[PDB]
């Protein structure tokens, strides 16, 4: 199967809601060493967001059950299942993070792509942070913050304030502050600034992006509204 | 480890929407050899309906894409379809093995026998949906034979309002309509099962009236769809 076949197959898998297949295809494409097209990058991101999302969702449900009880053996069952899920989740994150460090970030020749992958690095470390305990955690949280922060700096220097990828980074980075570092004040300030900068430079919207820009601008507001209530 | 641990784990898996795990747990329970309780039977059925249902759904999507196209593209869709079919068959064969080796042998009561024979019909029906040519006539027959034995027992041992009896009628009617492409037999079976149930409304019970009337409405829904 050549690069074109794998992408066709990944698109089939997506149609069939078989995201593990989808991930497998796009991992192979990534491993062929060349910089990914926007289409391929989105396919990779979607595959893995879904794959990891299933575990995140499962983990929250089991974690909630675990702590809500009770029979010290029923708790021990829930705890052991949680751990099985965490192991799956970590393997998935490590799989993506390996891909980022070995192929995607090194080959990102342009600022937009660099921001995209650095943000993705932030996200997958954030998924690890959601699930990490104790000695490991401070270090995982830092890795997340460091990746977001490099992305943020580049985005602020090299990208217009309405660029979807820049606004998406603001959204996610704000979420990092609120959920992982438990700093709502910093989260609000970042989200608000990114929004404010966008409305101030509305004349920068492009034909390719105006829909995605305004959508993500509204997601920022949604989060601000939720957070300031 | 122990039957209790497995069932607890299956219930967690269900909560987590991790049906492959759920199936695996209930397969181990089943393989311990003892007759399943109602709770365990529902857990087993749910796990496997979900596991197989994901493949059925995938298969329809890929199959529909395959037919709606070129070439090489169709060669890719066809090879993926086949990958999915192989998964689907393994799942069905896993359940059918379980039925033949454990569940049907151990069925002490008519209700349980009807339920597992119905389930046998269903999994053969899932195989038939996906079977081509020489294999198919034989898989279709296996399905019909299992439904038919279930139907017989249900008519001898079970009231016409019993949810499991009505469920069997629904599925068996569906077999006639979708696999054997015989709408008249499908309508007649569904109509009869419905009519016999309203005729013996006297028999609806505290435990079951909700499931009975629900499935009765599903029968009507199918009849309405089919006679339009």
């Amino acid at each position: 199967m050549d690069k074109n076949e794998l992408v066709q197959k990944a698109k089939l898998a997506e149609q069939a809601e078989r995201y593990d297949d989808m991930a497998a295809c796009m991992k192979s494409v990534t491993e062929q060493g060349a910089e990914l097209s926007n289409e391929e990058r989105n396919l990779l991101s979607v595959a893995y967001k879904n794959v990891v999302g299933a575990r995140r969702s499962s983990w929250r449900v089991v974690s909630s059950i675990e702590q809500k009880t009770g029979a010290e053996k029923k708790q021990q069952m829930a705890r052991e299942y949680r751990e099985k899920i965490e192991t799956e989740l970590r393997d998935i994150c490590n799989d993506v993070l390996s891909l980022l460090e070995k192929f995607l970030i090194p080959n990102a020749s342009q600022a937009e792509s660099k921001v995209f992958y650095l943000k993705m690095k932030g996200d997958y470390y954030r998924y690890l942070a959601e699930v990490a305990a104790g000695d490991d955690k401070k270090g995982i949280v830092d890795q997340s913050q460091q990746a977001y922060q490099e992305a943020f700096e580049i985005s602020k220097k090299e990208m217009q304030p309405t660029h979807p990828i820049r606004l998406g980074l603001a959204l996610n980075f704000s979420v990092f502050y609120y959920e992982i570092l438990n700093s709502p004040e910093k989260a609000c300030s970042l989200a608000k600034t990114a929004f404010d900068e966008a409305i101030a430079e509305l004349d920068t919207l492009s034909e390719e992006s105006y829909k995605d820009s305004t959508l993500i601008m509204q997601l920022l507001r949604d989060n601000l509204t939720l957070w300031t209530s | 480890m122990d039957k209790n641990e497995l069932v607890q784990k299956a219930k967690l898996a269900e909560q987590a929407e991790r049906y492959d795990d759920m199936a695996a747990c209930m397969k181990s329970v089943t393989e311990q050899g003892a007759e399943l309780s109602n709770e365990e039977r529902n857990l087993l059925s749910v796990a496997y309906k979900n596991v197989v249902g994901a493949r059925r759904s995938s298969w329809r999507v890929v199959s529909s894409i395959e037919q709606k196209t070129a070439e090489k593209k169709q060669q890719m869709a066809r090879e993926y379809r086949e990958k999915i079919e192989t998964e689907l068959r393994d799942i069905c064969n896993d359940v059918l093995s379980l039925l033949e080796k454990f569940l049907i042998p151990n069925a002490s009561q008519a209700e349980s026998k009807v339920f597992y024979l119905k389930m046998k019909g269903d999994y053969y029906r899932y195989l038939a949906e996906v079977a081509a040519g020489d294999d198919k006539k034989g898989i279709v027959d296996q399905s019909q034979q299992a439904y038919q034995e279930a139907f017989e027992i249900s008519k001898k041992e079970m009231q016409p309002t019993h949810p499991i009896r009505l469920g069997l009628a629904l599925n068996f009617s569906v077999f006639y309509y979708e696999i054997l492409n015989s709408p008249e037999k499908a309508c007649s079976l569904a109509k009869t099962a419905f009519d016999e149930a309203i005729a013996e409304l006297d028999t609806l019970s505290e435990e079951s009236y909700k499931d009975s009337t629900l499935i009765m409405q599903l029968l009507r829904d199918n009849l309405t769809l089919w006679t339009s």
């Binding site: 991101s45 979607v46 996610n172 993500i216 | 469920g167 599925n171």
Partner: peptide
């Protein structure tokens, strides 16, 4: 869907659109 017998929060991060 075959009409056979049926078988009886979030973070607020970037929604990943599906195409």
């Amino acid at each position: 869907r075959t009409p056979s017998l049926p078988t009886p929060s979030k973070c607020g991060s970037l929604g990943n659109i599906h195409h």
